[PDB]
Amino acid sequence: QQVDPAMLAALQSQPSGVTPSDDWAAAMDRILALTTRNPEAFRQQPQANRFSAILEAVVPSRTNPTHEKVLAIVNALTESKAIRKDEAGLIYNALLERVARYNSTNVQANLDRLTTDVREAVAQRERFMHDTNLGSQVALNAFLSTLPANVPRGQEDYVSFISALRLLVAEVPQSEVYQSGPDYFFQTSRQGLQTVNLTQAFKNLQGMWGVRAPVGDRATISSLLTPNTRLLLLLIAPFTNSSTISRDSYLGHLITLYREAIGQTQVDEQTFQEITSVSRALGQQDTGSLEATLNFLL
Amino acid sequence: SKEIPTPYMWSYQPQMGLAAGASQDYSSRMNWLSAGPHMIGRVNGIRATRNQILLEQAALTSTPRSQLNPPNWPAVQVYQENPAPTTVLLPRDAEAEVQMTNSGAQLAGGGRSSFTPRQAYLTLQSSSSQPRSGGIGTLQFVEEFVPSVYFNPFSGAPGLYPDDFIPNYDAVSESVDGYD
Amino acid sequence: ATPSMMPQWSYMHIAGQDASEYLSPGLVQFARATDTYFSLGNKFRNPTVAPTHDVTTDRSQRLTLRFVPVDREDTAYSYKVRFTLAVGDNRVLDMAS
């Protein structure tokens, strides 16, 4: 939920009340009675909690940030799942033994360099959540360095389909591709369904890019296509404008018609939101509020 | 096998209202083992329709969310109950009725009354003070959680699988809270 | 209903069409003209469905319910009771039951 780990290190090892040992500029801010909200609040403390603050502010203490700088590292390693969460009580029990064994002027200044690049040079972790080359760009640029670029029929639409497929894994942060076994896959979401067999799809689409099929043929592709190729073309449909594969290829009978099939449900869901909200507006059997509703929409 | 899968059907939790972890559909399968080529290409042409009906039903009906089987539903994505404000008919407005008894007349029985001409009646809100969260009903589980057709099944990294298909898995602990 | 399973039903004739419809009507004209002779009509699977709406009341109704007398007259020869049979706006009777 947080952005930075060192703020949680500054939340688990700093005093919540204002002390002059660490925040002098706020502890002296209220001794001299110069504060906007509640100014006159330090005279009326007795000699117990005046001298226990007014001595320690005009000459500060000299504490040791060794126990605090390591929590800005041990947290920064468990935020990125390098360590198990069940385990950080051991490594801080081992790093604090480490940097007190080999302590110097250098290591106290070398940890302090390392609690800055886990703050402002950990912006790469903010970066490839957006560009998602975790598993979407550099894991697919091996796939595009695997397919043959010499297709006999349809030389131009072959390199515009994968030009529209690299855009698919780029405009979606959740989708990713990977190497499992001798073939590459592609899931549209983490914790997600609809895994396409990406090797067994472009091998099915090879020798298929030029057909120029007529518009009176529907039930032939049970022995020609494969339903995951029929689902990969479903996942390429919203990111494919009308200028990719124009009109008369058999993919124009597929990719354009898949956008119309998505174009049905992206307005009939708004119809389905109306019907399920008027069954309780007039009084309708909720068991029979979905049987006849779906049959009108399928 | 991998291409036309028999779909993972869920199971309903009546207590918590969450999804009880899905299972392979094992109670609607045809016994096509005693069939030659002209029907085992027809049976596979049937399952390839219910794996396409269930994908054109999952878009029309289910709420688009990331975590399928979430442990704590939000307030707005759960069906509430907002009936009409309950119009309450007050019988006898006592602003001039306590003056009648102090005049000396004891009352009994019970416009609405003859001694006073006016009759006010109030309305008040009949919904809850806060909307409901944490658990969907039965009819919401009729609506959402259509049987998830899982193509190219279990074909990725650990954690990239649907881990909620295990009917023991806490969705926010990465772990079965088992016997402890 | 439930089109999650409907093409899986109608191929095996669970719901869908009776033997008048799905058979090619050359065979329907064949079998109906020959019933004294050879009598097809067995082994062709006429299915039936239930009316999926208009039977079920999702509100917690009650199939059967006893009533209680609101009086009695213990005459030495007679015995008279009166009842208060009443319904919740949506429960018709036949009164022979």
Coordinates of C-alpha atoms in Angstrom, one line a residue:
Chain A
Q1 CA 0.0 0.0 0.0
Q2 CA 3.0 2.2 0.7
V3 CA 5.4 3.6 -1.9
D4 CA 8.6 3.8 0.1
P5 CA 10.1 1.3 2.6
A6 CA 12.3 3.8 4.6
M7 CA 9.1 5.6 5.7
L8 CA 8.0 2.4 7.4
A9 CA 11.5 2.2 8.9
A10 CA 10.9 5.8 10.1
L11 CA 7.5 4.5 11.4
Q12 CA 8.8 1.5 13.3
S13 CA 11.9 3.0 14.9
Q14 CA 11.2 6.7 15.6
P15 CA 9.5 8.1 18.8
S16 CA 5.9 9.1 18.0
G17 CA 6.1 12.0 20.5
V18 CA 8.4 14.8 19.6
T19 CA 11.9 14.4 21.2
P20 CA 15.0 16.7 20.9
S21 CA 17.3 13.7 20.5
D22 CA 16.1 13.2 16.9
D23 CA 13.8 16.0 15.9
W24 CA 15.3 19.1 17.5
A25 CA 13.7 21.6 15.2
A26 CA 10.2 20.5 16.4
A27 CA 11.1 20.1 20.1
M28 CA 12.7 23.6 20.3
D29 CA 9.7 24.8 18.3
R30 CA 7.5 24.4 21.4
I31 CA 9.9 25.2 24.2
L32 CA 10.2 28.9 23.2
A33 CA 6.3 29.0 22.9
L34 CA 6.1 29.8 19.2
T35 CA 3.5 27.5 17.7
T36 CA 0.2 28.1 15.8
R37 CA -2.0 25.4 17.4
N38 CA -1.8 25.5 21.3
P39 CA 1.1 27.9 21.9
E40 CA 1.0 28.2 25.7
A41 CA 1.5 24.5 26.5
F42 CA 5.1 24.3 27.8
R43 CA 5.0 26.6 30.8
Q44 CA 2.2 24.6 32.3
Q45 CA 4.2 21.4 32.4
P46 CA 6.0 21.1 35.8
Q47 CA 9.7 20.6 36.6
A48 CA 9.4 16.9 35.6
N49 CA 8.8 17.4 31.9
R50 CA 10.5 20.7 31.5
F51 CA 14.0 19.8 32.5
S52 CA 13.7 16.5 30.8
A53 CA 13.2 18.3 27.5
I54 CA 14.7 21.8 28.0
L55 CA 18.1 20.3 28.9
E56 CA 18.1 17.8 26.0
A57 CA 17.3 20.5 23.4
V58 CA 20.0 23.1 24.0
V59 CA 22.5 20.2 23.9
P60 CA 21.3 17.2 22.0
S61 CA 22.0 13.6 22.6
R62 CA 24.2 11.5 20.3
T63 CA 22.3 8.4 19.3
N64 CA 23.2 5.6 16.9
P65 CA 21.2 5.1 13.6
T66 CA 22.8 1.7 13.0
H67 CA 19.6 0.0 14.2
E68 CA 17.5 2.3 12.0
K69 CA 19.3 2.3 8.7
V70 CA 19.1 -1.5 8.5
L71 CA 15.3 -1.5 8.7
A72 CA 15.4 0.8 5.7
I73 CA 17.2 -2.0 3.9
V74 CA 15.6 -5.1 5.4
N75 CA 12.2 -3.7 4.6
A76 CA 13.3 -2.7 1.1
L77 CA 14.3 -6.4 0.5
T78 CA 11.0 -7.8 1.7
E79 CA 8.9 -5.4 -0.2
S80 CA 10.4 -6.9 -3.4
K81 CA 9.9 -10.5 -2.1
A82 CA 13.6 -11.2 -2.0
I83 CA 13.2 -12.5 1.5
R84 CA 10.2 -14.4 3.0
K85 CA 8.1 -12.3 5.4
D86 CA 8.6 -15.1 8.0
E87 CA 12.3 -14.5 7.9
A88 CA 13.1 -10.8 8.3
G89 CA 13.4 -11.2 12.0
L90 CA 16.4 -13.4 11.3
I91 CA 18.2 -11.3 8.7
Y92 CA 17.9 -8.1 10.8
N93 CA 19.2 -10.4 13.6
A94 CA 22.1 -11.1 11.2
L95 CA 22.7 -7.8 9.4
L96 CA 22.9 -5.9 12.7
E97 CA 25.5 -8.5 13.8
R98 CA 27.3 -8.0 10.5
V99 CA 27.5 -4.2 10.4
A100 CA 28.5 -4.1 14.1
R101 CA 31.3 -6.7 13.4
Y102 CA 32.9 -4.9 10.5
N103 CA 31.8 -1.4 11.5
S104 CA 33.7 1.7 10.4
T105 CA 33.2 5.3 9.2
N106 CA 32.8 3.7 5.7
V107 CA 30.0 1.2 6.3
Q108 CA 27.9 3.7 8.3
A109 CA 28.2 5.9 5.1
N110 CA 27.8 2.9 2.8
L111 CA 24.5 1.9 4.2
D112 CA 23.4 5.5 3.9
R113 CA 24.1 5.4 0.1
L114 CA 22.0 2.2 0.0
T115 CA 19.0 3.7 1.7
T116 CA 18.8 6.2 -1.1
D117 CA 18.8 4.0 -4.2
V118 CA 16.1 1.9 -2.7
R119 CA 14.1 5.2 -2.6
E120 CA 14.9 7.1 -5.8
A121 CA 16.6 4.4 -8.0
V122 CA 14.0 1.8 -7.2
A123 CA 11.9 3.8 -9.6
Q124 CA 12.7 1.0 -12.1
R125 CA 10.2 -1.1 -10.1
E126 CA 7.7 1.7 -10.6
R127 CA 8.8 1.7 -14.3
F128 CA 8.3 -1.9 -15.4
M129 CA 5.0 -2.3 -13.7
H130 CA 3.9 0.1 -16.5
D131 CA 6.1 -1.0 -19.4
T132 CA 5.8 -4.6 -18.1
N133 CA 9.0 -6.0 -19.6
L134 CA 9.0 -8.3 -16.6
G135 CA 7.5 -10.9 -19.0
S136 CA 5.9 -9.1 -21.9
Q137 CA 8.5 -7.2 -24.0
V138 CA 11.8 -9.0 -23.6
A139 CA 10.1 -12.3 -23.1
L140 CA 8.2 -11.8 -26.4
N141 CA 11.1 -10.4 -28.3
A142 CA 12.6 -13.9 -28.1
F143 CA 9.3 -15.2 -29.6
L144 CA 9.6 -12.7 -32.5
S145 CA 13.2 -13.9 -32.9
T146 CA 11.8 -17.4 -33.3
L147 CA 9.0 -17.1 -36.0
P148 CA 10.1 -17.2 -39.6
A149 CA 9.8 -13.9 -41.4
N150 CA 9.4 -15.5 -44.9
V151 CA 5.7 -16.3 -45.3
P152 CA 4.7 -17.1 -48.9
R153 CA 1.1 -15.7 -49.0
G154 CA 0.5 -12.4 -47.2
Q155 CA 4.0 -11.0 -46.5
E156 CA 2.7 -7.7 -45.3
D157 CA -0.2 -8.6 -43.0
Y158 CA 2.0 -11.1 -41.1
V159 CA 4.3 -8.3 -39.8
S160 CA 1.3 -6.2 -39.0
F161 CA -0.4 -8.8 -36.9
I162 CA 2.6 -9.3 -34.6
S163 CA 3.0 -5.5 -34.7
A164 CA -0.5 -5.4 -33.2
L165 CA 0.5 -8.3 -30.8
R166 CA 3.5 -6.4 -29.3
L167 CA 1.1 -3.6 -28.6
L168 CA -1.2 -6.0 -26.8
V169 CA 1.4 -7.0 -24.2
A170 CA 2.5 -3.4 -23.9
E171 CA -0.8 -1.6 -23.2
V172 CA -1.7 -4.2 -20.6
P173 CA 0.3 -4.3 -17.4
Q174 CA -1.2 -7.6 -16.2
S175 CA -0.5 -9.8 -19.2
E176 CA 2.8 -11.6 -19.6
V177 CA 4.4 -14.3 -21.7
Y178 CA 6.9 -16.9 -20.6
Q179 CA 9.1 -20.0 -21.4
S180 CA 7.6 -23.2 -20.0
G181 CA 8.8 -26.3 -21.8
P182 CA 9.8 -26.0 -25.5
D183 CA 7.0 -23.6 -26.2
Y184 CA 5.9 -20.1 -25.3
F185 CA 2.5 -19.2 -23.7
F186 CA 0.5 -16.0 -23.1
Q187 CA -2.0 -15.4 -20.3
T188 CA -4.2 -12.3 -20.4
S189 CA -4.1 -11.9 -16.6
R190 CA -2.2 -13.1 -13.6
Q191 CA -4.5 -15.4 -11.6
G192 CA -6.1 -15.6 -15.1
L193 CA -7.7 -17.9 -17.6
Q194 CA -7.5 -17.9 -21.4
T195 CA -3.9 -19.2 -21.8
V196 CA -3.2 -19.3 -25.5
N197 CA -0.7 -21.9 -26.8
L198 CA 1.3 -19.3 -28.6
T199 CA 3.6 -21.7 -30.4
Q200 CA 0.7 -23.9 -31.5
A201 CA -1.2 -20.9 -32.8
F202 CA 1.3 -19.2 -35.1
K203 CA 2.2 -22.7 -36.5
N204 CA -1.5 -23.0 -37.2
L205 CA -1.6 -19.6 -38.7
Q206 CA 1.4 -20.3 -40.9
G207 CA 0.3 -21.2 -44.4
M208 CA -3.0 -19.4 -43.8
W209 CA -2.3 -15.6 -44.2
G210 CA -3.4 -15.6 -47.8
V211 CA -6.7 -17.4 -48.6
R212 CA -9.1 -14.8 -50.0
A213 CA -12.0 -16.9 -48.8
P214 CA -15.7 -16.3 -49.8
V215 CA -18.4 -15.3 -47.4
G216 CA -20.4 -18.5 -47.7
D217 CA -18.1 -20.8 -45.6
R218 CA -18.5 -21.2 -41.8
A219 CA -18.1 -24.8 -40.6
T220 CA -14.9 -25.7 -42.5
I221 CA -12.3 -24.5 -39.9
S222 CA -12.9 -27.3 -37.5
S223 CA -10.2 -29.2 -39.4
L224 CA -8.3 -25.9 -40.4
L225 CA -8.3 -23.7 -37.3
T226 CA -7.8 -24.5 -33.6
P227 CA -10.0 -23.0 -30.9
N228 CA -7.1 -21.4 -29.1
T229 CA -6.1 -19.7 -32.3
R230 CA -9.8 -18.8 -32.4
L231 CA -9.2 -17.4 -28.9
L232 CA -5.9 -15.7 -29.7
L233 CA -7.8 -13.9 -32.5
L234 CA -10.3 -12.9 -29.8
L235 CA -7.6 -11.5 -27.6
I236 CA -6.2 -9.5 -30.6
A237 CA -9.6 -8.2 -31.6
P238 CA -9.9 -5.0 -29.4
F239 CA -6.4 -3.8 -30.3
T240 CA -6.9 -4.2 -34.1
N241 CA -8.3 -1.4 -36.1
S242 CA -9.9 -1.7 -39.6
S243 CA -6.6 -1.0 -41.4
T244 CA -4.6 -4.1 -40.3
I245 CA -6.2 -6.9 -42.4
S246 CA -8.5 -5.0 -44.7
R247 CA -11.6 -6.8 -46.0
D248 CA -11.2 -10.0 -47.9
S249 CA -8.7 -12.3 -46.2
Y250 CA -10.3 -15.0 -44.1
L251 CA -8.9 -13.2 -41.1
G252 CA -11.2 -10.4 -42.3
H253 CA -14.0 -12.9 -41.9
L254 CA -12.6 -13.6 -38.4
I255 CA -11.0 -10.5 -36.8
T256 CA -13.6 -8.1 -38.0
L257 CA -16.4 -10.4 -37.0
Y258 CA -14.9 -11.0 -33.6
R259 CA -15.0 -7.2 -33.0
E260 CA -18.7 -7.3 -33.8
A261 CA -19.2 -10.2 -31.4
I262 CA -17.4 -8.1 -28.7
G263 CA -19.5 -5.2 -30.0
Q264 CA -22.6 -7.1 -29.2
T265 CA -21.8 -7.7 -25.5
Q266 CA -20.3 -4.3 -24.8
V267 CA -23.8 -2.8 -25.3
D268 CA -25.9 -5.8 -24.3
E269 CA -24.3 -5.8 -20.8
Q270 CA -25.8 -2.4 -20.4
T271 CA -29.1 -4.0 -21.5
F272 CA -28.5 -6.8 -18.9
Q273 CA -27.9 -4.2 -16.2
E274 CA -31.3 -2.7 -16.9
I275 CA -33.2 -6.0 -16.8
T276 CA -31.7 -7.3 -13.5
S277 CA -32.6 -3.9 -11.8
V278 CA -36.2 -3.8 -13.0
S279 CA -37.0 -7.2 -11.5
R280 CA -37.0 -5.7 -8.1
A281 CA -38.6 -2.4 -9.3
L282 CA -41.9 -4.1 -10.2
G283 CA -41.6 -7.4 -8.3
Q284 CA -40.3 -10.5 -10.1
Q285 CA -39.3 -14.0 -9.2
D286 CA -35.5 -13.8 -8.9
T287 CA -35.2 -17.5 -10.0
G288 CA -37.0 -16.6 -13.2
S289 CA -35.2 -13.3 -13.5
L290 CA -32.2 -14.9 -15.4
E291 CA -33.6 -17.8 -17.4
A292 CA -35.6 -15.8 -19.9
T293 CA -33.1 -12.9 -19.7
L294 CA -30.2 -14.8 -21.1
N295 CA -32.2 -16.4 -23.8
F296 CA -33.1 -13.0 -25.2
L297 CA -29.4 -12.0 -25.2
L298 CA -27.7 -15.2 -26.5
Chain B
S1 CA -7.8 -32.3 -23.8
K2 CA -6.0 -29.0 -23.5
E3 CA -8.0 -27.5 -26.3
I4 CA -11.7 -28.3 -25.5
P5 CA -11.6 -28.6 -21.7
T6 CA -14.4 -29.7 -19.5
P7 CA -15.1 -26.5 -17.6
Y8 CA -14.3 -25.8 -14.0
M9 CA -17.6 -25.5 -12.2
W10 CA -17.6 -23.6 -8.9
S11 CA -19.3 -24.6 -5.6
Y12 CA -21.4 -22.3 -3.4
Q13 CA -20.6 -21.5 0.1
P14 CA -23.9 -20.9 2.0
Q15 CA -22.2 -19.7 5.2
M16 CA -19.5 -17.2 4.1
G17 CA -21.1 -16.5 0.7
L18 CA -17.7 -16.7 -1.1
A19 CA -16.8 -19.3 -3.8
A20 CA -15.9 -22.6 -2.3
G21 CA -13.2 -23.5 -4.8
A22 CA -14.0 -24.9 -8.1
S23 CA -13.8 -28.4 -9.5
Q24 CA -13.7 -30.2 -12.8
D25 CA -17.1 -30.9 -14.2
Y26 CA -17.4 -34.6 -13.6
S27 CA -21.1 -35.1 -13.8
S28 CA -22.2 -34.2 -17.3
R29 CA -19.7 -36.0 -19.4
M30 CA -20.8 -38.1 -22.4
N31 CA -19.5 -41.6 -22.5
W32 CA -18.1 -41.3 -26.0
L33 CA -15.6 -44.1 -25.5
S34 CA -17.9 -46.5 -27.5
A35 CA -18.0 -44.3 -30.6
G36 CA -16.3 -44.2 -33.9
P37 CA -15.1 -41.2 -35.9
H38 CA -18.5 -39.8 -37.1
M39 CA -19.6 -39.0 -33.5
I40 CA -16.4 -38.3 -31.5
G41 CA -16.0 -35.4 -33.9
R42 CA -19.6 -34.4 -33.1
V43 CA -19.2 -34.8 -29.3
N44 CA -16.1 -32.5 -29.4
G45 CA -18.3 -30.2 -31.5
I46 CA -20.7 -30.0 -28.6
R47 CA -18.3 -29.2 -25.8
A48 CA -16.7 -26.6 -28.1
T49 CA -20.1 -24.8 -28.0
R50 CA -20.6 -24.9 -24.2
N51 CA -17.0 -23.6 -24.0
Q52 CA -18.1 -20.7 -26.2
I53 CA -21.5 -20.1 -24.6
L54 CA -19.8 -19.9 -21.2
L55 CA -17.5 -17.3 -22.6
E56 CA -20.3 -15.2 -24.2
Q57 CA -22.1 -15.6 -20.9
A58 CA -19.2 -14.6 -18.7
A59 CA -19.0 -11.2 -20.5
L60 CA -22.7 -10.4 -20.4
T61 CA -23.2 -11.3 -16.8
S62 CA -20.2 -11.4 -14.5
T63 CA -18.7 -8.3 -12.9
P64 CA -15.3 -7.5 -14.4
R65 CA -12.8 -8.0 -11.5
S66 CA -9.2 -9.0 -11.1
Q67 CA -9.4 -11.5 -8.2
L68 CA -11.9 -14.1 -9.1
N69 CA -13.1 -15.6 -5.8
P70 CA -12.4 -12.5 -3.7
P71 CA -12.5 -12.8 0.1
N72 CA -14.2 -9.5 0.8
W73 CA -16.7 -8.0 -1.7
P74 CA -17.0 -4.2 -1.9
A75 CA -20.2 -2.4 -0.9
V76 CA -21.3 -1.3 -4.4
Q77 CA -20.9 -4.6 -6.2
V78 CA -23.3 -6.4 -3.9
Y79 CA -27.1 -6.3 -4.3
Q80 CA -28.6 -4.1 -1.6
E81 CA -32.2 -3.8 -0.5
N82 CA -33.8 -0.4 -0.7
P83 CA -37.6 -0.6 -0.2
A84 CA -40.0 2.3 0.0
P85 CA -39.8 4.7 3.0
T86 CA -42.3 3.3 5.5
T87 CA -45.2 5.8 5.7
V88 CA -46.5 5.6 9.3
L89 CA -50.0 6.8 10.0
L90 CA -50.0 8.4 13.4
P91 CA -53.4 7.9 15.0
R92 CA -53.9 10.9 17.3
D93 CA -51.6 14.0 17.4
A94 CA -51.2 14.7 21.2
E95 CA -50.5 18.4 20.8
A96 CA -54.2 19.1 21.4
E97 CA -55.2 15.7 22.9
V98 CA -53.4 16.2 26.2
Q99 CA -55.4 19.4 26.6
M100 CA -58.7 17.4 26.3
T101 CA -57.8 15.1 29.2
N102 CA -56.7 18.1 31.4
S103 CA -60.1 19.6 30.7
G104 CA -61.5 16.6 32.5
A105 CA -62.6 14.1 29.9
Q106 CA -61.1 10.7 30.2
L107 CA -60.7 9.0 26.9
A108 CA -61.4 5.4 25.8
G109 CA -61.8 3.3 22.7
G110 CA -59.6 3.4 19.7
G111 CA -61.9 12.3 10.9
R112 CA -59.8 9.8 12.9
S113 CA -61.0 11.5 16.1
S114 CA -63.8 14.0 16.5
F115 CA -62.3 16.3 19.1
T116 CA -59.3 17.1 17.1
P117 CA -59.6 17.9 13.3
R118 CA -56.0 17.4 12.3
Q119 CA -54.1 14.1 11.7
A120 CA -50.4 14.2 10.8
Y121 CA -48.5 11.2 9.6
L122 CA -44.7 10.8 9.2
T123 CA -42.4 8.9 6.9
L124 CA -39.0 7.5 7.7
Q125 CA -36.1 5.7 6.0
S126 CA -36.5 1.9 5.7
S127 CA -33.1 1.0 4.4
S128 CA -30.1 0.1 6.6
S129 CA -27.8 2.8 8.0
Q130 CA -24.8 1.4 6.1
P131 CA -24.8 -0.7 3.0
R132 CA -23.7 -4.3 3.2
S133 CA -20.2 -5.7 2.4
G134 CA -18.4 -9.0 2.8
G135 CA -20.2 -11.9 1.1
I136 CA -22.6 -12.3 -1.7
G137 CA -25.9 -14.1 -1.6
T138 CA -27.2 -17.1 -3.5
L139 CA -28.8 -15.2 -6.4
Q140 CA -25.6 -13.2 -6.8
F141 CA -23.8 -16.6 -7.1
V142 CA -26.4 -17.6 -9.6
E143 CA -25.6 -14.4 -11.5
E144 CA -21.8 -14.3 -11.2
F145 CA -19.4 -17.3 -11.0
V146 CA -20.3 -18.9 -14.3
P147 CA -18.3 -22.1 -14.8
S148 CA -14.8 -20.8 -15.7
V149 CA -13.6 -22.5 -19.0
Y150 CA -9.9 -22.8 -18.4
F151 CA -8.0 -23.2 -21.7
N152 CA -4.4 -24.6 -21.9
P153 CA -4.8 -25.7 -18.3
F154 CA -2.1 -25.3 -15.7
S155 CA 0.5 -24.0 -18.1
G156 CA 2.6 -21.4 -16.4
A157 CA 4.5 -20.1 -13.4
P158 CA 3.6 -20.9 -9.8
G159 CA 1.4 -18.1 -8.6
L160 CA 0.3 -17.5 -12.2
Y161 CA -2.1 -20.4 -11.9
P162 CA -5.6 -19.8 -10.6
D163 CA -4.8 -20.7 -7.0
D164 CA -8.5 -20.3 -5.9
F165 CA -9.5 -23.4 -7.8
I166 CA -8.0 -25.3 -4.8
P167 CA -11.0 -25.6 -2.5
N168 CA -8.9 -24.9 0.6
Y169 CA -7.1 -21.7 -0.4
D170 CA -7.2 -18.4 1.5
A171 CA -7.3 -15.6 -1.1
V172 CA -5.3 -13.2 1.1
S173 CA -2.9 -15.5 2.8
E174 CA -1.2 -17.5 -0.1
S175 CA -1.8 -20.5 2.2
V176 CA -4.3 -23.1 3.5
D177 CA -5.1 -22.2 7.1
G178 CA -5.1 -25.9 7.8
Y179 CA -5.5 -27.7 11.1
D180 CA -4.0 -24.7 12.9
Chain C
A1 CA -33.5 -23.3 -19.5
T2 CA -29.8 -22.9 -18.4
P3 CA -28.1 -22.5 -21.8
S4 CA -24.8 -23.4 -20.1
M5 CA -25.8 -27.0 -21.0
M6 CA -28.5 -26.7 -23.7
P7 CA -26.5 -27.9 -26.8
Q8 CA -25.3 -30.8 -24.6
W9 CA -28.9 -31.7 -23.8
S10 CA -30.5 -31.4 -27.2
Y11 CA -28.0 -33.7 -29.0
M12 CA -29.0 -36.5 -26.6
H13 CA -32.7 -35.3 -26.6
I14 CA -33.0 -34.3 -23.0
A15 CA -34.8 -31.1 -23.9
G16 CA -35.4 -29.5 -27.3
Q17 CA -37.5 -31.1 -29.9
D18 CA -39.8 -34.1 -29.9
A19 CA -39.7 -36.9 -32.5
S20 CA -42.0 -35.0 -34.8
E21 CA -39.5 -32.2 -35.2
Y22 CA -35.9 -33.3 -35.3
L23 CA -36.4 -36.4 -37.4
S24 CA -36.3 -35.8 -41.2
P25 CA -40.0 -35.7 -42.1
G26 CA -39.6 -38.4 -44.7
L27 CA -39.2 -40.8 -41.8
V28 CA -42.0 -39.2 -39.8
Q29 CA -44.4 -39.8 -42.8
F30 CA -43.0 -43.3 -43.0
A31 CA -43.4 -44.4 -39.4
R32 CA -46.9 -42.8 -38.8
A33 CA -48.4 -44.5 -41.9
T34 CA -47.0 -47.9 -40.7
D35 CA -48.0 -48.5 -37.1
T36 CA -50.3 -51.6 -37.4
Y37 CA -47.4 -53.2 -39.4
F38 CA -44.1 -52.3 -37.9
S39 CA -44.9 -49.6 -35.3
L40 CA -42.0 -47.3 -34.9
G41 CA -42.5 -44.8 -32.1
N42 CA -40.7 -46.8 -29.6
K43 CA -36.9 -46.2 -29.7
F44 CA -37.1 -42.5 -30.7
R45 CA -37.0 -40.6 -27.4
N46 CA -39.8 -38.2 -26.9
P47 CA -38.5 -35.7 -24.2
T48 CA -40.5 -33.7 -21.7
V49 CA -39.6 -30.5 -19.9
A50 CA -41.1 -28.9 -16.9
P51 CA -42.5 -25.4 -16.9
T52 CA -39.5 -23.7 -15.4
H53 CA -41.3 -20.5 -14.5
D54 CA -44.7 -20.2 -12.8
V55 CA -44.3 -23.1 -10.3
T56 CA -41.8 -21.9 -7.8
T57 CA -42.4 -19.2 -5.2
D58 CA -39.1 -17.8 -3.9
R59 CA -40.9 -16.3 -1.0
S60 CA -41.1 -18.7 2.0
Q61 CA -44.6 -20.0 1.4
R62 CA -46.0 -23.1 3.0
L63 CA -47.3 -26.3 1.4
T64 CA -49.7 -27.2 4.2
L65 CA -50.9 -25.7 7.4
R66 CA -53.3 -26.6 10.2
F67 CA -55.7 -24.1 11.7
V68 CA -57.0 -23.7 15.2
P69 CA -60.6 -23.3 16.4
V70 CA -61.4 -19.9 17.9
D71 CA -64.4 -21.3 19.9
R72 CA -66.2 -24.5 21.0
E73 CA -69.6 -25.5 22.2
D74 CA -69.7 -28.6 24.4
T75 CA -73.4 -29.4 24.0
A76 CA -74.4 -32.8 25.3
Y77 CA -75.2 -33.8 21.7
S78 CA -73.6 -31.2 19.5
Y79 CA -70.1 -29.7 19.1
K80 CA -69.7 -26.5 17.1
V81 CA -66.5 -24.8 16.0
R82 CA -65.7 -21.8 13.8
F83 CA -62.4 -21.2 12.1
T84 CA -60.4 -18.4 10.6
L85 CA -59.0 -19.7 7.3
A86 CA -57.2 -16.9 5.6
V87 CA -54.4 -16.5 3.1
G88 CA -51.6 -14.0 2.4
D89 CA -52.9 -12.4 -0.8
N90 CA -51.4 -15.0 -3.1
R91 CA -52.5 -18.4 -2.1
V92 CA -55.5 -19.8 -3.9
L93 CA -57.2 -23.0 -2.8
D94 CA -59.4 -25.7 -4.2
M95 CA -61.1 -26.2 -0.8
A96 CA -61.7 -29.9 -1.7
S97 CA -58.3 -30.5 -0.2

